Amino acid sequence: ADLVPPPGYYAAVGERKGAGSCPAVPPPYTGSLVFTSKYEGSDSARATLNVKAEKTFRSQIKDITDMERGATKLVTQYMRSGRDGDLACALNWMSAWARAGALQSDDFNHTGKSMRKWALGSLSGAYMRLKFSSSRPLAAHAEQSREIEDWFARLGTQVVRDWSGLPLKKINNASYWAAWSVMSTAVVTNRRDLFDWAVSEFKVAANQVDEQGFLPNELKRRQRALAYHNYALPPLAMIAAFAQVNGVDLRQENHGALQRLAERVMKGVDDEETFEEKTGEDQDMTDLKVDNKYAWLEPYCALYRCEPKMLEAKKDREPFNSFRLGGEVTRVFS
């Protein structure tokens, strides 16, 4: 059977009254993907922010950032209000990068291949709505659609190469996000090999969740441990939600590991104690205060019967927008 997204991705294009213009496409990024890490100089915990290095990093990736944020924004605006100019603009941006063969460099380091997988997830995740909307907005744009989908397929194959062949100690949230990008790409391109890789990566993650709901590789990030556990949830929950409607039920993998992880995270958010006791360090709660970092609640509560605690957590923070997940996460799960 052809691969499909969750049913919410088939929603008609909206007609909400809102009209921004079409900005120039960010220059397609065809350079080397060898970037400075924001954690440059850290010990093995890789949890010490280097402000100067981060500034350098953000500058290096600026065109990629602008592409990710801008193109998802255009798709979101189109799905909300249905102005053809926004569709045309979004497709012009994505097809420009596709034709240029952006982000395809074989010259990369960890930070660089992470930019490749992140941008792939953002763009394909947004494009998913265009592709499967009952309005069929791509019907009039066959050439561009083909160009864009072929580019996604090239990048997806490369992302599998980028994160394959690793031992567990080197498989962390970075791989989970890569698996989301590859799952998203798999459904856009109807590529079962990509689908299968993302599923296998989820299963690795599920088996990394220990008997208490902790991930050893995320615990290693010391004061950022809780933040990184929360950061693991969105791609894992998205992968499971996508796999489910394609006939692969991952909810019970390793004794319901995804639920065990989610419940442990939410315990830590209520009270940091157990993560501190587990890591021996006070947790940086900064990221746990950011509403959109709980976007994982949308696919999660589509998968599991959420108890009132989870439901209220979702209700209080809705709607969720997360460009790395394709934009409007609440809308595609309602």
Residue numbers in the entry: 28 to 45, 47 to 362
What does the original paper state about this entry?
The alg operon also encodes a periplasmic lyase, AlgL. The structure reveals that AlgL adopts an (α/α)5 toroid fold with five pairs of antiparallel α-helices.
However, H202A displays a similar growth pattern and cellular morphology to WT. When we compared the structure of the mutant with the WT AlgL enzyme, we found that there were strikingly similar with a Cα RMSD of 0.062 Å. Examination of the structure reveals that the orientation of the side chain of K66 is altered, with the Nζ oriented toward the ManA ligand in the WT structure and oriented away from the active site in the H202A structure. This conformation appears to be stabilized by hydrogen bonding between R74 and R249 and hydrophobic interactions between K66 and L67. To allow for the interaction, R74 in H202A AlgL is oriented toward subsite +1 within the active site, which is occupied by ManA in the WT structure. In WT AlgL, R74 is oriented away from the active site, suggesting that this residue may be important for anchoring the lid-loop in a closed orientation in the absence of a ligand.
